[PDB]
Amino acid sequence: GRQSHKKIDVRNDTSTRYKGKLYGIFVNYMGEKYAQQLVENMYSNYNDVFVEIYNKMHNALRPTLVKLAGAGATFPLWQLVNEAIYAVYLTHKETASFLVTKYVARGVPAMTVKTLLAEVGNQLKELVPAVAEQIGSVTLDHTNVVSTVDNIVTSMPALPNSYAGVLMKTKVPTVTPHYAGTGTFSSMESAYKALEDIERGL
């Protein structure tokens, strides 16, 4: 027993693993070039949506998750942050009442949920413009987040998940981390990428 201790996360190769595996699958559907372009577009979309939103949120919230419920049993918190990003923000499909009811029904203290909702809002507003504009300049807290988010969600009807999928970032261009203003901080990550190819003779 106790064979190994696997770890699941974005390891700077999930890109290539995804690309290569789906390429190998789809060659028997498309032929070489068509499958190539297909997997290229597929991964680009998956990146700019899932990575840019969910992975940044998970990386930001991991430490506070450990602070609150330090455990391997933080999986329900992951459920909560996922639904919050999808079901509440960007869709206005459910109010804070629903999440708090559900997760206290699942055994989560309420104020924990309120705090998590507060922080995910405070960061998603930095990631996505439209959500920041809908919430305005209101710092969220486990004292005020519920009323504010409930107002925002009830003000809007159920939004089509087409907003949540691609269009939201598609319509609006944003500052790059290769810019002035507040876009002058992150390329360190991308920087390594460059170095890599130069070392590989690429």
Partner: protein
């Protein structure tokens, strides 16, 4: 894909398309050589068959839900679009609540789908005779809820 009433043709379509996907899966690059061997071919055939059988066995509840939604809509003279929408609602409510009971009370989902259907919830429809009729969404929503609980004998 356009609307097609479920029938054996659909079963066979799913079967063959899964055959294609599986032969794509096994020989990740050497699809041709794997395609030439009859043995892995038999294996892939049986796999696709098992997969279709799985998918069928896990669909009859949704069929029943769509059926009862159709009956109710026909009884209340509702255009096809909203019939499909209520089919989706019924499948959702049976799945998350009746079967697995995700952590949410019924009335909560009810109000969620209510906000879904707003624009507010008493819609007017013109029958084939020219007699306009009106129906409340929330009422017929709650109606199929009880109707659903009758089916599974909950």
């Amino acid at each position: 894909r356009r609307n097609r009433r479920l029938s054996s043709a659909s079963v066979y379509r799913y079967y063959l398309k899964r055959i294609s996907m599986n032969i794509g899966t096994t020989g990740h690059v050497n699809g041709l050589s794997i395609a030439g061997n009859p043995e892995i071919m038999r294996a892939i055939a049986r796999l696709s068959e098992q997969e279709t059988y799985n998918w069928v066995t896990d669909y009859a509840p949704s069929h029943l839900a769509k059926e009862v939604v159709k009956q109710i809509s026909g009884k209340y003279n509702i255009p096809g679009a909203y019939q499909g929408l209520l089919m989706a609602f019924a499948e959702k409510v049976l799945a998350n609540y009746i079967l697995d009971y995700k952590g949410e009370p019924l009335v909560e989902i009810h109000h969620n789908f209510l906000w879904e259907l707003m624009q507010g919830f008493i819609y007017t429809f013109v029958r084939k005779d020219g007699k306009p009729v009106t129906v409340d969404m929330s009422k017929v929503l709650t109606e199929i809820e009880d109707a659903l609980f009758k089916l599974v004998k909950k």
